[PDB]
Design a protein around this ligand. Sequence first.
Ligand SMILES: Cc1cc2nc3c(=O)[nH]c(=O)nc-3n(C[C@H](O)[C@H](O)[C@H](O)COP(=O)(O)O)c2cc1C
Ligand SMILES: Cc1cc2nc3c(=O)[nH]c(=O)nc-3n(C[C@H](O)[C@H](O)[C@H](O)COP(=O)(O)O)c2cc1C
Ligand SMILES: [Cl-]
Ligand SMILES: [Cl-]
Ligand SMILES: [Cl-]
Ligand SMILES: [Cl-]
Ligand SMILES: [Cl-]
Ligand SMILES: [Zn+2]
Ligand SMILES: [Zn+2]
Ligand SMILES: [Zn+2]
Lengths: 266, 266, 284, 264, 284, 393
Amino acid sequence: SKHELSLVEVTHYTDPEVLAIVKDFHVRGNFASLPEFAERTFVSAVPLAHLEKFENKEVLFRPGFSSVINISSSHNFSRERLPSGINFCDKNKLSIRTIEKLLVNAFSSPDPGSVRRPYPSGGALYPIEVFLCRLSENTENWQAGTNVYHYLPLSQALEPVATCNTQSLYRSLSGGDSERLGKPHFALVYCIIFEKALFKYRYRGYRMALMETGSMYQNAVLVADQIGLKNRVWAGYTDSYVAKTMNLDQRTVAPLIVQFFGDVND
Amino acid sequence: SKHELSLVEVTHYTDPEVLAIVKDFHVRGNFASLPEFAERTFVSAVPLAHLEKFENKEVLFRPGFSSVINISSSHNFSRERLPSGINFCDKNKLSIRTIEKLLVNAFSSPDPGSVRRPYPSGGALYPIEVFLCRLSENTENWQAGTNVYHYLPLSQALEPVATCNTQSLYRSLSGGDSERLGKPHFALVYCIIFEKALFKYRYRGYRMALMETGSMYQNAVLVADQIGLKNRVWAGYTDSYVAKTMNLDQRTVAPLIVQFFGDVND
Amino acid sequence: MINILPFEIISRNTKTLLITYISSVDITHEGMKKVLESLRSKQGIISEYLLDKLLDESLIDKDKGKEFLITTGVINKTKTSPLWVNSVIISDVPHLFSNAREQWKCDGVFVSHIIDIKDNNINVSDSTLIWLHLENYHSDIVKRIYSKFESNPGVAFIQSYYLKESFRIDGVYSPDLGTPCHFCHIERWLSREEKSFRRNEMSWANLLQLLKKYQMTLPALALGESERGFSYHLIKRRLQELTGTSLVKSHVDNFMSSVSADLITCILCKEPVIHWQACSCLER
Amino acid sequence: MINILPFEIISRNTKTLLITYISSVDITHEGMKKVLESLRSKQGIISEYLLDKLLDESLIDKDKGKEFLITTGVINKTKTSPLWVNSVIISDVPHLFSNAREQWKCDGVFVSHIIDIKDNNVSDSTLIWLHLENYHSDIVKRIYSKFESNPGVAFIQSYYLKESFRIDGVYSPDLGTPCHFCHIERWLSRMSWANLLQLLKKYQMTLPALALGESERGFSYHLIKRRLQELTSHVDNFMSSVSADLITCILCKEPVIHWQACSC
Amino acid sequence: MINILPFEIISRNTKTLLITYISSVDITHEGMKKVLESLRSKQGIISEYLLDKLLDESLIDKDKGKEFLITTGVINKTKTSPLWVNSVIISDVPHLFSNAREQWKCDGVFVSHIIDIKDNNINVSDSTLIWLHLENYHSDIVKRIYSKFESNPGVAFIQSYYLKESFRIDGVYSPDLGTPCHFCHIERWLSREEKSFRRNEMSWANLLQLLKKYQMTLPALALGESERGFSYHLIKRRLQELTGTSLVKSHVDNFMSSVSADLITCILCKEPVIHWQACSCLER
Amino acid sequence: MINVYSNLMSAWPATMAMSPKLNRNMPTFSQIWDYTPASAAGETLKSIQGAIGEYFERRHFFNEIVTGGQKTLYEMMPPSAAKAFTEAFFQISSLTRDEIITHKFKTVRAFNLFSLEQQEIPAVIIALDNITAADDLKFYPDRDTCGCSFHGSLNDAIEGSLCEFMERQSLLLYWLQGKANTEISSEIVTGINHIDEILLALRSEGDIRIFDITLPGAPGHAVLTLYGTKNKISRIKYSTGLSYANSLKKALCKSVVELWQSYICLHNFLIGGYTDDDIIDSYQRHFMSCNKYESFTDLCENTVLLSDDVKLTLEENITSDTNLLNYLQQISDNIFVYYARERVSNSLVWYTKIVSPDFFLHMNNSGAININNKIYHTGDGIKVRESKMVPFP
Ligand SMILES: Cc1cc2nc3c(=O)[nH]c(=O)nc-3n(C[C@H](O)[C@H](O)[C@H](O)COP(=O)(O)O)c2cc1C
Ligand SMILES: Cc1cc2nc3c(=O)[nH]c(=O)nc-3n(C[C@H](O)[C@H](O)[C@H](O)COP(=O)(O)O)c2cc1C
Ligand SMILES: [Cl-]
Ligand SMILES: [Cl-]
Ligand SMILES: [Cl-]
Ligand SMILES: [Cl-]
Ligand SMILES: [Cl-]
Ligand SMILES: [Zn+2]
Ligand SMILES: [Zn+2]
Ligand SMILES: [Zn+2]
C-alpha cells in the first residue's frame, strides 16, 4: 500500500515474443492430477521397483574413483531438518498467531519499516507472490468465510482473495494423492507473475524467479521446524485448477509450488 | 562413493524430445556477459532512471484498495539478513575450515552416516550439484593448483575438478561487472544435470530443479551470515564460459547461478 | 468395475491359445477355456457378480481365476469413479457416428447421445463431456454451444474440426479446472500458420481485426471416407483415454492437452496450449 | 539409365579379387583391374556412352564387358521411369476395400483389382498389397510363390501383431529390397513371440487381430491409402517399414535390411 | 577511441542543418559547421588529438564541443578493447568482398584480409575472428578451417552459407567461451527441415547414417545480385555488432546467437542454438 | 542422450543411449542394450559408431552365419591348409585324425589373406551359436570372437580384424611366456586430455604399468595397460586394456580407453546391485572373478622385459613400420579371412574374421585349444599358465 507497484508500469517493458515463449514452455510442466484420473494417468517415468536406486545419491565428476578430500562433521552446528510431514492430522486447533509467526519470519524483516526481505531477489524485483490457503475447519481464521489470502511481505498484512469452501481448496491443492497427504491445517502457494519476472532480464528472469521460489519455501521449511510445524513441499496438483480455485488469472500469474503445513499425530 | 549413482542408469529413462525442448528453452536465458562487450551489450530492458520504481515493492491482488489484516512485527524472532556484499576485499587470509563450515552446514546433515540433507528435493532426486571456485591467492587451498572442486553432500568431501588459474576462473564467473564486484575469496556455482532433472517428472522436473537451486543458495545465504561472511548471488556471467572454465560438458550439465563469498573492508 | 480387454481365444482340434495384449497362454484347463469363451462375447463392462458366476459354473477358484484373468491381461479391476458421468457427441455429420454408441461400449466408452447441430432445445446432464465435431467449421457454432452449456455443473468440452491438412482435437475445456477453451486453441494454430517467423502474432493489423465481430471459418482439404475413418478412430481413442477403458496410462503433463494429426503423413502431435490473452474463457 | 553398384577390390601379390553384393570373382585380365579401379570411383550413375568410353579405353570388348559387370553385380539398368503402373490389393477382408478403387482415384492412387485371398483362377509392373487380418507366414509364402517371378513385380504386406498394425518394406526382386521373411527373422533374432508363432504353425492356426472394430479398420484403411500414395523415390522409401500402435495412434517408421540366410 | 557516426550536413545559402540518428540541429555557429564539415570526410575512427585540433582551428571549447558532438549523435567515446583484435573473411566468392575492406572502415569494422578458400598456407594472428562465407557449401571446407585454426589463441569463427531459401549466419564459435560450432547449427536446421513433427531427430535411420563418413552438401536456390547484396549487408552489420561501431546495443541473451534470414520475405530470425549431442566441439 | 527405443515387435534393439557425463575431458561412453550390452568409449561420434558396430558384430557371429554345404577338410580347401586344420582339431578333441578327415564340416566362405585364393573353412570356428554347426562341436567346442570386426569398408573390416588378431595372439603368447618387448613409463604424458585425465585418475586410485607385448619381430605395437589397487574403498581392485596399432601413441591411447571401459562397466555393474544372474558371458564371469590385486601383481612381478630401460618417449623405429602381411606370411601361409556383407540403403557393410590354424584359434587355454602352433609349443613358457585362462575379458 505504501510500497504498491502497479503491473501496468511493468507491462510497459514487456517483450511479447518473450512472454509467449516462456508461457508455452511453462505449460509443458503443468499436471492434470486428480483422484478421478489416478487409474488412467501416471506421474513417474521410472517404475516403483527401480526408484530407490536413484534416491538420495551423489553423482561424481570422476565416476569410478574415490580420491576425495574429506571434511569433518565436527564443523556442523545445525539441526537435522525434520522429516517432511506426511499423513497430516488436524485434531488440534491451530492459531492464527502461529501462522503469523511463519509468514513474518520466513518472508519479512523484523523491522516493519524496512524493505529488505530475508531472501534475495534478482534486481530486487521480487516477482513471486505467497498465497495462504485455509484447509481445515479446525484452523483459526482472521475473517470468516475467507480461506484464501495474499501475503504482503513489506506491509506485513493479509489481503483477502477467496471465499471458496475449505473442501474445494484442499481438493485442488492436494491433487490425486490426498489420501496419503491426510488433513493439513493450511498451505502456502507460491506463484510467478510472468510479466514481472521477464520485463528486466528477459528469458533469464524466469530462471531467477523459479530459484527465488525455492529460497522462499526453504525459509518456510527452516522457520516451520523452529516453531513446531511439520511441512511438505508439494508438486502433485492440477496447476490450472488451483489457479481457478484461488481466483487467479492464468494469463498473468501461475502456481509454481504448493507447500503444506500442520501436525502429524493420532 | 558409498552413495554413488551412475548417470548411465538415469539415461535409461530419458525422453529425448523432452531433453531437447528443455535445453532449447534453457539456452534463451544464457548471457554473453564480458568486459569486452560492455559498451556493445546491455542487461536491463528498463533504463537506469526508471528502475527504482520497480524495486522492493508489493503487487496487490486488490490494486487501489487498502483493507488488509495487519500482522505484528512482535512475532518476528529472526535477524535481518545482512546487506548482500558488494565490492569484496581479500586483504585477509581465509581458511579452508571456514569454507568447510559453509559447505557442511548449508548442504549436509550433522550426522555423517545420514542421507537426509538440510533442504528438500522432488522425489529425493537432488539433480543440482555444488562446485566451489577458489578466486583469490589469499584463499587457502586443500590441494595445490586446484581451484575448482565438486562438493559431495552425503560423502561430505571435495572432489578435484580443475587446475585453471585463479584469474581465469574469476574472469568467467564475474562477467562484465567485475570492477564493482571486487575481489571475493571464493564462489559456489550451482548446476543442473539436465537428464537427472527430467527423467522421472519430465518437464516439471526442470521447474523443481530450478527451485531446488534457490533452496540451496538460501541455506548458503543464511549459513554465511552466521559465520561472518558477506555474500552475493550473481547472475551476470557468460554461462558457456563458466562451464568450459570448470571443465563441464554443457550437453549434460549447466551453471544456473553463481554465488560469491568473502569480506567487505579496507 | 471389471473391464474386459481385447483378447482372442483360438482352437483347432487339440490346442487352445489365449492371445492378449500382455500375454499368450497355453490353456490346459477346460473350465478356463469356457470362462474365456464367455468373456469374449461380453462387450466391455461386466459385474464381479457375473464373473464369479462364470467361474463358479466352470469350477474355478474365484480368487485364483481372478488372479489368472487379471495377470494375463484378459481383464482388470478399476475402482475410481470418473470426472464425467457420461458423454455426448454433437456434430454437423451425425450420420458419421450412427453405430458409435453401440460399438464403443466394448472400448468401455459410455456415449449417451449422438446429437445433430441442427437440433433445438438440446439438453445435457450434469458432469457430461460434450464432444463437438465439425466438418464445416464456424466459430459461432462453438459460441452457441458454450453459451448453452458453459454453466452446466461439472461440464467439459472437446472440439474437433479440420484445418489445412490437419485434424484438430482441442484440449479439454473444463470451466471447473480452468483450462483453455476452443478459441485459445484456434488462435494458437492461426498464429503458427502465418508467415511471421515470430511466435507472438500481434501488430496493428491484428488490433484492427479485433474491432470487427469475431466470426470466422477455416480452409481445409476435401475429406474422403478414409480421412473420416482416421478421424473416427482418433475420436474414440481420445474418449477412451478420458472416460473409457484405459489401455495405456497417459502422463499427467499431457492428459488434458490438444492432439493434432496430419492427414497426409498420419503423424500425431500432442501439445498443451496456453490461454490466449484476448480470450474471455477465464473471466467467465 | 545404368547404375554403378557398390563393391570392393582386394588386390595383393599379382592377384585381384572383386566382391560385390552377390558374387566373388578372381579378376584375371589387367585391363579389367583398370575398368574396376575406375568404376569404383563412380557413385551410381552413368550413360552407356560413359561406360563404353571406359570399356573401349580398356579394350576389354565393350559388348562382353557390359555382360560381365551386369552378371557380377557391379552395374545394372535402373528404370528411368517410376516403378509401378498400378497396384492390386489381395486380402482376407476384401469387403473392407470395395469402394477403395472408386475413392482413391482422387488422391492420385490407382488400385485396379481387389482380390479375395481365397481364390484360384497379375500383369507386368504390379505392386501387390497383401493385407491380412488373420496372419500366417504360409499365406505370404503362397502369394510370393504365385507371382515372385512376374516382370517388374513388387510386394508389400500388412498385418496385425497384437496392438500394432504393421506395414513391411516393399519387396522388389528387381530392386533387390528385403522380403517379408527378412522382416520376421530380424524381429525374432532377438511364452515368447517365436514360441507363439511356432505353436500356431505347429497346431495349424492363423494369428488373429485382437478385436478389430470399424474404427481400427478405418485407421488401417487410411494408412494403406497414404502409404500407396507414397509409392506413386529414394531407396529408403522402399527399405522402410511402418508400425502403427492402434491404441495410441502413433506411427513409427523403421529401416529394413535383408537376412543373409533368406533366399529372396 | 572517438567513433564518427552516420550524419549529414546540408546547406543552401542561409540555413545549415545537422541531421543525425539522434537529432536534427539548426547550427548557428561558423566554427561548428567547419568541424562538422571536417568530421564528415573522416572515415569511421578518429583520434581525440585530431578532434581537439579540428575544434581548436574553429575556436570551439574542447570540452564544450565534445559535449555537443556526443549529445547530438555525431560522435561517441568508447574505452574498452574488444575480444578480437581483427577479422578476416575466408570465402569461395572473394570477388564479392573486394571493396569490403575499404568500405567497412566507416562502419568501424577492421577487416585485415579477404582470403580465397582455394589458397594454401593461409595464416591467422591471435585473437582473430574468422568469417567463412560459402555460396557452394561443403562440410569438409569447414572441417579444414577448424582443423587449421581451432587451437589459435583467442580465435573465434562465424560461418555463413545458404540453405533452402534462407541465408544462415551461425552463432559465434569461440573455443575459449565454449559456444556451439558450425555442426551444432547445421544439425539444428536439418532436423527442423524434416517432416517428423518432433524436435528430436533420432531413429535407427539416423544411427545408420552416422556410420558413414560425415560429409554433406545442402539444397539452396539460385542467388542473384540482390540476394548477395542482402547477404553482404547482413554480414557487415553482424561484424559491426561484434567488432565495430556499435549503433544499437544488443541484449546479452542474443549477442552470440545465430541469425537466419528468409530471402523471399526478408524476415530475420535470431536464435541461440544448443550443442548437438553427437558433435565433438566441446571435447576439443 | 540419443535415447532411441524400439518396441518388442522391432528388428532393432530396445535401447541405444549415449551416457551423460559432468567432466568434458572424460570420454563418452555409448551403449546398446537388448536382452550382452554392446558399448564403446572415446570421442563422441566414435563412441556411437563403436557401440553400433559392436552390436552389429555380435549379432552376425551369434545369429546370421550362412553355411555353404557340408564338406571334408581336404574337400573344402587346399591340402596344406587342411593338414593345418587337421592338426589343430586333433589337439582340440579326443577324436582321432581318421575321424577328423572323414568328417563333413559345415562350411563358410573365406579367402587367403596373402594370395586372395578363395576357399572355405569350417563354420564351427566362426559361428558362436549351437544351432549353426551343431554336429561339428565335438571337434571344436570352445568358440569366441577373436579377430572379428564390422565396418562399412572391407579394407577397414580387415584392418580391424588384423588388429584384433595381433592383440590376442600377442596377449596369449604374453600370458604363456611372460615376455614383453618393453615397458613404457607409467608417468608418461600423452598430451591428449582424455588420455592423460584417465592415467592421472588411475595413478591416484592405485598403480599402473604399461607393457609393449607385441609379437616378437612384428611391426606395430600391442600395448597392454595394467591397473591394480590395494585400496579398500575402491571396488575395482584390478583392470586391463589392450590395443594394437601401427602407431605406439595410438595403440597406447586406445589401450588406456579400453581399460577405462572395463573399469567403468564393471564398477557400474558392481555399485548397481546387479547379481550373478545378470552376468551371462563366460569370459565376463571369469574377468569378474579376477578383480583382485593378485591379478595385477602376478602379471607385473613375473613380466620379463627384453629391453629393461623404460621408454620415456613414444618414438618410432626400424621394425615398427615394416609390412605386417610379410611378417605374418613368414610365420604361416594358412591365414584366412572369413567375410560377409549386407546391403544398408545403397551401401555395403562388412563382417570379417581373421582365422589361422597355425596360430591360436581362440583365447581360452583353460578350454580345448591348439596349444601347439607356429608361435608356441607346450613347455616353452610358464607351465601353470598353459592350464589357466588369462585375466582378460
Ligand atoms: C519441488 C518439490 C516438490 C515436491 N513434490 C512432492 C509431491 O508432489 N509429493 C510428495 O509426497 N512430496 C513432495 N516433495 C517432498 C519430497 O518428496 C521430499 O523432500 C523428499 O522425499 C525427501 O524427504 P524429506 O524431505 O522427508 O527429507 C517435494 C519436494 C520438493 C522440493
Ligand atoms: C537469482 C539472483 C541473481 C542475482 N544476480 C545478481 C547480479 O547479476 N549482479 C548483482 O550485482 N547482484 C545480483 N543479485 C543480488 C541482488 O541484486 C540483491 O539480492 C538485491 O539487490 C537485494 O539486495 P540485498 O540482497 O542487499 O537485500 C542476485 C540475486 C538473486 C536472487
Ligand atoms: Cl505413478
Ligand atoms: Cl545495462
Ligand atoms: Cl438452441
Ligand atoms: Cl591449407
Ligand atoms: Cl594406426
Ligand atoms: Zn479461451
Ligand atoms: Zn527375404
Ligand atoms: Zn559443435
